[PDB]
Amino acid sequence: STPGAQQVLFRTGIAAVNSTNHLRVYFQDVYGSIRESLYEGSWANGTEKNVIGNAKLGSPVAATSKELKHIRVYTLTEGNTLQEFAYDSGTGWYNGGLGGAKFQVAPYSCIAAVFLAGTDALQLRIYAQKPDNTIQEYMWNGDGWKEGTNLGGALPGTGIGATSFRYTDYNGPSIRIWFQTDDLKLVQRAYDPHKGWYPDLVTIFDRAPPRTAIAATSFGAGNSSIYMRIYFVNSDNTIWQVCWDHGKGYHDKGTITPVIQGSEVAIISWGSFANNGPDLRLYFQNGTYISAVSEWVWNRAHGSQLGRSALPPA
């Protein structure tokens, strides 16, 4: 290992945000602090100096952005309330208003977060699990944090993945979330502006490890068209990918890369098939320097490859 890698919590929550190939990755250190590593032509940071706040040890870590102008990082307090670390260009980092609402969630809750797509407005949707094991949506629409739609029961401790996109023929954003139910299946719920939340769950994987990590992205929105990718840790101790492609639906799935038992997972993307992409980056723990965070890359030029073997501070 390295003194650097040893600072990274084993099975840390992982999140990532980007503006094309300008990357930020969030993780928890062994003292409970949330740190940011960065890629701006090369990897940097992830040190004691790149602390953006503190969270309960073992906390989920979620993040969403509007390019790198506005970044929001979500975690649990020691009291099992949702909290938020915020960055705005020109202001830097501060404690977001989410914590002030004191939303109490199950101590084992995960978190997902999206900015709503296709608007300049800063509108956020956060997904977590309440003590009754239901998935609750929380909303910011410019005038305080409020509860949104309750999305029903899920396996206690389920991973939660989420993405927002805007079809170019729609007048408003869509949302898709993924989670695990008590029967251990992985499922999708869906929100469109005309149907609201679709009544029924769509199964994307028949049986997954209990509380397996779940991470999702979408890209290349067009007229009533989208591409989506969902990742989770399967029982073979690897990340698997599930593929939605326009015109084919949920038509394929397969292993991507080995991880440590119980690794968490983050995904970012940019670009589209129509324009010499997309690009995909996955972050996870695969045992490099024991506890370092590693990267997997997909692009058009070279397809599937391992990227940075050990992210800063390793």
Ligand SMILES: CC(=O)N[C@H]1[C@@H](O[C@H]2[C@@H](O)[C@@H](CO)O[C@@H](O)[C@@H]2O[C@@H]2O[C@@H](C)[C@@H](O)[C@@H](O)[C@@H]2O)O[C@H](CO)[C@H](O)[C@@H]1O
């Ligand atoms: C090794 C090398 O010199 N090039 C290969 C590498 O590409 C990286 C470079 O092309 C670099 C040029 O300045 O641009 C990088 O963006 C790219 O790296 C990858 O993407 C960035 C955004 C981060 O995720 C990096 O950790 C990641 O490695 O890798 C590519 C594709 O995987 C090609 O092999 C290049 O030949």
Ligand SMILES: CC(=O)N[C@H]1[C@@H](O[C@H]2[C@@H](O)[C@@H](CO)O[C@@H](O)[C@@H]2O[C@@H]2O[C@@H](C)[C@@H](O)[C@@H](O)[C@@H]2O)O[C@H](CO)[C@H](O)[C@@H]1O
């Ligand atoms: C690549 C690099 O060396 N970045 C360092 C630099 O980053 C900051 C500058 O780019 C600055 C220009 O006005 O804007 C800052 O907000 C930016 O901060 C970095 O990017 C944003 C989006 C956040 O992710 C920040 O946490 C991150 O630091 O200078 C800073 C210190 O000011 C850091 O050393 C970066 O390493």
Ligand SMILES: CC(=O)N[C@H]1[C@@H](O[C@H]2[C@@H](O)[C@@H](CO)O[C@@H](O)[C@@H]2O[C@@H]2O[C@@H](C)[C@@H](O)[C@@H](O)[C@@H]2O)O[C@H](CO)[C@H](O)[C@@H]1O
């Ligand atoms: C300038 C200022 O006083 N900011 C404090 C205020 O933050 C809100 C304002 O910053 C407002 C005007 O620019 O923008 C809001 O977006 C912002 O709230 C933050 O961003 C939104 C998208 C949500 O993520 C919020 O939870 C988050 O705070 O009030 C906050 C508390 O809400 C802080 O005190 C800011 O310093």
Ligand SMILES: CC(=O)N[C@H]1[C@@H](O[C@H]2[C@@H](O)[C@@H](CO)O[C@H](O)[C@@H]2O[C@@H]2O[C@@H](C)[C@@H](O)[C@@H](O)[C@@H]2O)O[C@H](CO)[C@H](O)[C@@H]1O
């Ligand atoms: C897959 C398909 O073509 N039809 C399903 C699907 O409905 C589609 C359909 O309404 C089209 C209209 O062009 O818009 C979407 O593709 C929609 O699917 C919804 O969004 C996609 C991105 C996925 O997340 C999908 O799971 C979701 O349902 O779903 C409906 C459910 O009412 C029916 O199952 C159609 O037969």
Ligand SMILES: CC(=O)N[C@H]1[C@@H](O[C@H]2[C@@H](O)[C@@H](CO)O[C@H](O)[C@@H]2O[C@@H]2O[C@@H](C)[C@@H](O)[C@@H](O)[C@@H]2O)O[C@H](CO)[C@H](O)[C@@H]1O
């Ligand atoms: C839509 C479809 O049939 N997908 C196949 C396909 O996927 C490839 C393929 O569409 C080529 C076309 O030359 O473009 C990419 O390689 C695409 O890859 C898929 O999307 C990228 C973003 C990644 O998520 C990657 O993991 C994924 O496979 O061929 C592959 C095998 O090479 C599969 O058979 C898909 O189901």
Ligand SMILES: C[C@@H]1O[C@@H](O)[C@@H](O)[C@H](O)[C@@H]1O
């Ligand atoms: C985008 C939509 O915004 C509000 O209407 C919420 O009540 C819905 O759950 C959804 O998040």
Ligand SMILES: [Cl-]
């Ligand atoms: Cl110093």
